[PDB]
Amino acid sequence: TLGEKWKNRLNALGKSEFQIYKKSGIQEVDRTLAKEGIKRGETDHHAVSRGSAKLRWFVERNLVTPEGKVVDLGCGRGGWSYYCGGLKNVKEVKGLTKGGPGHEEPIPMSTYGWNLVRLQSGVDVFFTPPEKCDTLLCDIGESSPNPTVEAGRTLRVLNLVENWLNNNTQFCIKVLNPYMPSVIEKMEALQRKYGGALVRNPLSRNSTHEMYWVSNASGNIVSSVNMISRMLINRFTMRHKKATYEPDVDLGSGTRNIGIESETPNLDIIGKRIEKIKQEHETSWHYDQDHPYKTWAYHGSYETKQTSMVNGVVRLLTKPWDIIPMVTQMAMTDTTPFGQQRVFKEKVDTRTQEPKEGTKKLMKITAEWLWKELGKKKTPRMCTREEFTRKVRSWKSAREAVEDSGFWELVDKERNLHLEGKCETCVYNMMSRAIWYMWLGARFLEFEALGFLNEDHWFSRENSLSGVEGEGLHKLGYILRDVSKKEGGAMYADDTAGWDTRITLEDLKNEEMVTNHMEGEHKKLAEAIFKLTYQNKVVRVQRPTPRGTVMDIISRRDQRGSGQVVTYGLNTFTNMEAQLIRQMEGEGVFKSIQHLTVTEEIAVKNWLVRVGRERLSRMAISGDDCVVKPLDDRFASALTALNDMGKVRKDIQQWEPSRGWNDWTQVPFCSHHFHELIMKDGRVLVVPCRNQDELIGRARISQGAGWSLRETACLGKSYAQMWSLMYFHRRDLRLAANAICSAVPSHWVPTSRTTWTHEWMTTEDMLTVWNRVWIQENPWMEDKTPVESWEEIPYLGKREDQWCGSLIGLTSRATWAKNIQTAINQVRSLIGNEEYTDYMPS
Numbered sequence: 001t002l003g004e005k006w007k008n009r010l011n012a013l014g015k016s017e018f019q020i021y022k023k024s025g026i027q028e029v030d031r032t033l034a035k036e037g038i039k040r041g042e043t044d045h046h047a048v049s050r051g052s053a054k055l056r057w058f059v060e061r062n063l064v065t066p067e068g069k070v071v072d073l074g075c076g077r078g079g080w081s082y083y084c085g086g087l088k089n090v091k092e093v094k095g096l097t098k099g100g101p102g103h104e105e106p107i108p109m110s111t112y113g114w115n116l117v118r119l120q121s122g123v124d125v126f127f128t129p130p131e132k133c134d135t136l137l138c139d140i141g142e143s144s145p146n147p148t149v150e151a152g153r154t155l156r157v158l159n160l161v162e163n164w165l166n167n168n169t170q171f172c173i174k175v176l177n178p179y180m181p182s183v184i185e186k187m188e189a190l191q192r193k194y195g196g197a198l199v200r201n202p203l204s205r206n207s208t209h210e211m212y213w214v215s216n217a218s219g220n221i222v223s224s225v226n227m228i229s230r231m232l233i234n235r236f237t238m239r240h241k242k243a244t245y246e247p248d249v250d251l252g253s254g255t256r257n258i259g260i261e262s263e264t265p266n267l268d269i270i271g272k273r274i275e276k277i278k279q280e281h282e283t284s285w286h287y288d289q290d291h292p293y294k295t296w297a298y299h300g301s302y303e304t305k306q307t308s309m310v311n312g313v314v315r316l317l318t319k320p321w322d323i324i325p326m327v328t329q330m331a332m333t334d335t336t337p338f339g340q341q342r343v344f345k346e347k348v349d350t351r352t353q354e355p356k357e358g359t360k361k362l363m364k365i366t367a368e369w370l371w372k373e374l375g376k377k378k379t380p381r382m383c384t385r386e387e388f389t390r391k392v393r394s395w396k397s398a399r400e401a402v403e404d405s406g407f408w409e410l411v412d413k414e415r416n417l418h419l420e421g422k423c424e425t426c427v428y429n430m431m432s433r434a435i436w437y438m439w440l441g442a443r444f445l446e447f448e449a450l451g452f453l454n455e456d457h458w459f460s461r462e463n464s465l466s467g468v469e470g471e472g473l474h475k476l477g478y479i480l481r482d483v484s485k486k487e488g489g490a491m492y493a494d495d496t497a498g499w500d501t502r503i504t505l506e507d508l509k510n511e512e513m514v515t516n517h518m519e520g521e522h523k524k525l526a527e528a529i530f531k532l533t534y535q536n537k538v539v540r541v542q543r544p545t546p547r548g549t550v551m552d553i554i555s556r557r558d559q560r561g562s563g564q565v566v567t568y569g570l571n572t573f574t575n576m577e578a579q580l581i582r583q584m585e586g587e588g589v590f591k592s593i594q595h596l597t598v599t600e601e602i603a604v605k606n607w608l609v610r611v612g613r614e615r616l617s618r619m620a621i622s623g624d625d626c627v628v629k630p631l632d633d634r635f636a637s638a639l640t641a642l643n644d645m646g647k648v649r650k651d652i653q654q655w656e657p658s659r660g661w662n663d664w665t666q667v668p669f670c671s672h673h674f675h676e677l678i679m680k681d682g683r684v685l686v687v688p689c690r691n692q693d694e695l696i697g698r699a700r701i702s703q704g705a706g707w708s709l710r711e712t713a714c715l716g717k718s719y720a721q722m723w724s725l726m727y728f729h730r731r732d733l734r735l736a737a738n739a740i741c742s743a744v745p746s747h748w749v750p751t752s753r754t755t756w757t758h759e760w761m762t763t764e765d766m767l768t769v770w771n772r773v774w775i776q777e778n779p780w781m782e783d784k785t786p787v788e789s790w791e792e793i794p795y796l797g798k799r800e801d802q803w804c805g806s807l808i809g810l811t812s813r814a815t816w817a818k819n820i821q822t823a824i825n826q827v828r829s830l831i832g833n834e835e836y837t838d839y840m841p842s
């Protein structure tokens with residue numbers, strides 16, 4: 001007896017205990033999304049099974065390094081071989097599985113690398129001749145209540161991978177039951193010849209003793225097996241049987257081509273930049289060899305120390321949300337060791353097929369037209385350092401350094417160099433999302449060149465027709481409605497999968513055309529920004545090595561990296577361009593992306609001049625977020641130009657017609673939907689609204705360290721005064737907002753920062769600010785009669801409120817409301833003895 005002591009404890013165990021025990025303290029991956037998307041026909045990004053994740057756990061620790069020809073016996077739907085398709089050093093993948101009634105048939109998928117992946121069904125790998133291969137995977141092994149049975153099957157598959165192994169071969173072989181001495185004897189033999197060791201995957205459920213014979217591992221067999229046997233036993237009795245959740249594998253998209261992938265850098269530009277990082281180390285520096293990067297250019301690494309609080313005031317006043325998981329889990333921070341590297345390899349380590357010649361012309365003329373149209377009633381310019389320092393409204397405190405005078409001599413050095421045509425301190429530092437931090441000095445230069453776009457309001461709706469820059473949420477809704485009035489098809493709000501990684505080099509050269517309309521000292525500077533630091537970036541990213549974390553530095557030309565405040569401009573620009581070119585395609589201006597006939601290149605030019613402005617007004621565009629009401633619904637199939645520019649829509653098959661909204665109130669825009677609210681006096685309001693959990697959860701989270709109690713309480717007061725001015729139409733949030741203000745000293749000025757208009761920051765009475773923004777100043781309201789009690793401002797309907805997230809009618813919330821006064825005093829008592837107003841209605 002051994003781990004068989006485990007198996008009878010398990011076989012002798014009820015149905016529900018079994019399911020409880022199965023997923024206890026194990027690691028799981030959220031498959032709800034992929035499983036729903038694969039039914040809807042989405043044939044890329046998604047993994048086809050839990051298997052991809054499982055295998056990724058081995059690969060990212062180098063326990064298997066798949067490479068070359070990859071045979072995959074018992075490939076099932078394809079989880080392992082698809083995953084292997086996108087891996088760097090892999091050149092071919094063949095998957096063989098039985099298939100047939102009772103077994104899994106493979107799933108076809110446009111997953112990254114799929115072109116190198118041949119899955120065959122109707123194949124008994126026990127009956128087929130071996131083939132040359134450089135890495136061999138196998139995942140066969142039927143479990144059974146009976147341990148002797150499984151050793152049988154386990155030994156069968158062990159006797160099979162041996163025919164396929166050579167001695168240099170890489171492998172990952174499931175050992176269904178490694179605790180029987182039948183298997184413990186053969187595995188020792190096998191380990192003597194071919195090496196490796198058994199390794200347990202934490203994503204395996206507790207109901208199977210699977211261990212994987214993986215090539216690049218080492219260790220003693222019997223002990224490794226017994227370690228797992230007691231770990232699985234311990235877990236029968238485990239208190240706290242919740243399961244930890246990983247996000248699933250993002251398996252990419254599109255085909256793989258040895259020639260086309262891989263950056264050829266122009267080290268005559270990124271150069272003076274890298275060897276500077278080198279010198280700042282040169283000791284710990286080393287050119288790693290197993291670097292993961294496959295679409296970026298590697299250069300070297302160096303040591304680096306590996307690298308959100310709850311707001312008690314808000315939290316104490318939102319007690320019914322202490323058990324909603326979509327609220328309390330936003331405060332948790334998911335610091336897996338490979339978690340950053342995973343987002344990089346799946347989402348940023350991607351390439352985009354260069355557009356066709358005809359796409360490129362369409363873009364170049366539309367951009368050429370647009371930049372001119374944007375600059376009719378506007379003129380570029382540099383932006384002062386004093387102008388820059390002025391944003392002392394949010395060394396080691398960009399403020400403190402904004403005057404260390406030294407600073408401006410350092411910014412002064414490289415700035416001449418940009419004028420000569422080089423940089424040295426213009427590197428990005430990377431940190432589901434990525435943010436490309438940059439040196440506080442470098443962000444000056446780019447502000448001094450391109451600051452004018454975000455500072456003279458070039459994408460203001462009034463100046464660029466499609467923009468919504470500088471429009472509060474109390475206007476975007478009326479603006480969408482204004483578009484719905486336009487006569488045409490349905491409203492389309494397609495999102496792009498990972499927009500910034502989809503910026504092409506052509507995209508960047510097109511946007512650089514704003515330097516046409518510049519000239520002088522200025523132009524040369526805004527030429528360096530574009531050419532030197534936008535089209536030719538160098539980046540630092542951390543990465544975990546078996547020698548401890550290192551900071552690789554890599555470089556890539558493609559994609560959008562820049563100041564999150566400057567990229568907004570260009571993203572709107574190019575998206576405006578892209579949505580125009582799509583509108584064309586639907587209307588029929590041009591008919592092929594490969595060539596633009598001279599007589600079509602004219603139609604494009606005409607249309608642009610004859611209706612271009614009108615087409616722009618059919619669009620609400622904020623960066624990659626867009627809303628389009630075109631002439632007819634032929635827009636919903638005009639996908640050739642969209643796809644070829646790289647702006648691949650998110651969450652449907654590449655050539656699936658887009659779905660249009662026939663009710664603007666459901667059109668998602670700027671992370672909100674907008675309801676149409678009618679007062680008791682019958683004036684109509686268009687109000688912003690979103691899942692109320694993302695609102696509560698946001699408000700209960702604090703930025704940074706050192707928040708005192710007076711700050712923590714003024715941050716909550718910001719969130720509350722914002723709720724009552726924007727989300728006043730939701731019961732919970734207006735109650736919670738009133739509670740917060742009754743519990744924070746009424747004389748304290750809210751100061752902090754909510755999101756990214758901010759009328760809720762005044763210390764005025766909120767009802768006054770309400771009347772200003774919603775009545776005496778929105779244009780969509782001609783009757784300027786003031787409302788003089790909160791009992792005049794309306795709510796959504798009950799059913800809408802609880803649909804958009806409310807808790808009204810749940811007993812816990814009802815209890816929260818009867819006692820809100822007890823809660824306000826808990827917090828007031830905590831704050832101390834100050835002057836409090838009482839906003840709660842009776």
Ligand SMILES: Nc1ncnc2c1ncn2[C@@H]1O[C@H](CSCC[C@H](N)C(=O)O)[C@@H](O)[C@H]1O
Nearest residue numbers: 049051074076079080097098103124125139
């Ligand atoms: N004799 C045989 N020949 C080929 N495939 C077999 C087989 N016996 C079982 N299999 C198949 O092997 C698969 C292993 S489970 C496959 C999961 C896979 N690793 C993934 O990532 O998706 C099962 O679908 C089973 O049908």
Ligand SMILES: Nc1ncnc2c1ncn2[C@@H]1O[C@H](CSCC[C@H](N)C(=O)O)[C@@H](O)[C@H]1O
Nearest residue numbers: 061062063064199215216217218337544546
């Ligand atoms: N953060 C961590 N904490 C504890 N163990 C870790 C770890 N990260 C990795 N490991 C373990 O360290 C191992 C590195 S695998 C090393 C394989 C090696 N390249 C060879 O050729 O033999 C993984 O198996 C994992 O089990």
Ligand SMILES: [Zn+2]
Nearest residue numbers: 675689690804
């Ligand atoms: Zn709503």
